[PDB]
Amino acid sequence: YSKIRIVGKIDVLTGLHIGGGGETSMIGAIASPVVRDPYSRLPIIPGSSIKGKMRSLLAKHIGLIPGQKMHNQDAPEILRLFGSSQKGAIQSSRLQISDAFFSKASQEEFDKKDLAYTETKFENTISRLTAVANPRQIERVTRGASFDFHIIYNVENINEVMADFENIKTAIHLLENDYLGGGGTRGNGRIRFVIDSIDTVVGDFDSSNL
């Protein structure tokens, strides 16, 4: 039983809008603020969004059982990797995807050029009936942002580690094509998992060939 870290980075290729809540909108300010970790007041990519997007894309690639009403009905590879909660037959998740924080490198390259971390994109909604717009402000994340994604893989069945990492590779390739966060259908969310560093944090497992 070993624990392997996949710490790397995420290069946003367009705006990234992972919305939030709990703050009332000052009149004329951002209507849909981006989620920020309150202590640093920086936009972040919650690990829940990453894990959900990876799981959804991988399930679509592998195939969904027709009439699937719950997440626990996915293919056994998906349940083995991302976790399942059935009645009595519960499978632990070997993937633990943490919140990806704003990188210090991107923070420095944005402090240079005097560039704000987020971009208040200005949008509208032309109705189909009266053809009247409706202003909206969305707090996207700028293109230069890099996020320190941190994933832990737990090796439980040593025989399935290779196939599980092939699944992870397929899912991250699907994510390189698919977006992260909301509004991805309208230009947001594009990313690329360019930077990686995989090694065995705990145990004796071989992490050189992964």
Binding site: M26, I27, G28, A29, R41, A116, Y117, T120
Partner: protein, 125 residues
């Protein structure tokens, strides 16, 4: 608690007194577009103020607030209605006391007062 009192209740009552009905006309005929432009400038400075975490206003935001006062004067010169609104709500005087205090809190209550002015101006229409 800016100056003299100046609060959100002051905003609601001043919009009430300056409201006159013939159609509804406020501050001797101030359209909502001019107020929205002023609030847009307020938002532009307020976003930078909010993003910074320190409690003391920086030099950049202070210069932007002086610019905001100049823009207020320009808008008053452009249209008499905006001039009467600025004089009846004393917004530029609040900008001055915000500059004098050099505190983020005073700017935040100033922005709250401006937003209250906008909200009550739209509500009474």
């Amino acid at each position: 608690e800016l100056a003299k009192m100046i609060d959100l209740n002051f905003a609601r009552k001043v919009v009430e007194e300056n409201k006159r009905v013939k159609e509804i006309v406020l501050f001797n005929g101030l359209t909502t577009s001019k107020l929205r432009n002023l609030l847009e400038l307020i938002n532009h400075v307020y976003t930078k103020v909010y993003n910074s975490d320190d409690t003391t206003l920086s030099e950049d935001v202070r210069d932007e607030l002086e610019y905001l006062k100049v823009k207020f004067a320009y808008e008053s010169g452009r249209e008499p209605a905006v001039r009467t609104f600025i004089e009846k709500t004393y917004v530029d005087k609040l900008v001055d006391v915000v500059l004098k205090k050099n505190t983020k809190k005073i700017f935040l209550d100033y922005c709250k007062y401006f937003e209250a002015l906008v909200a009550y101006a739209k509500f009474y229409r």
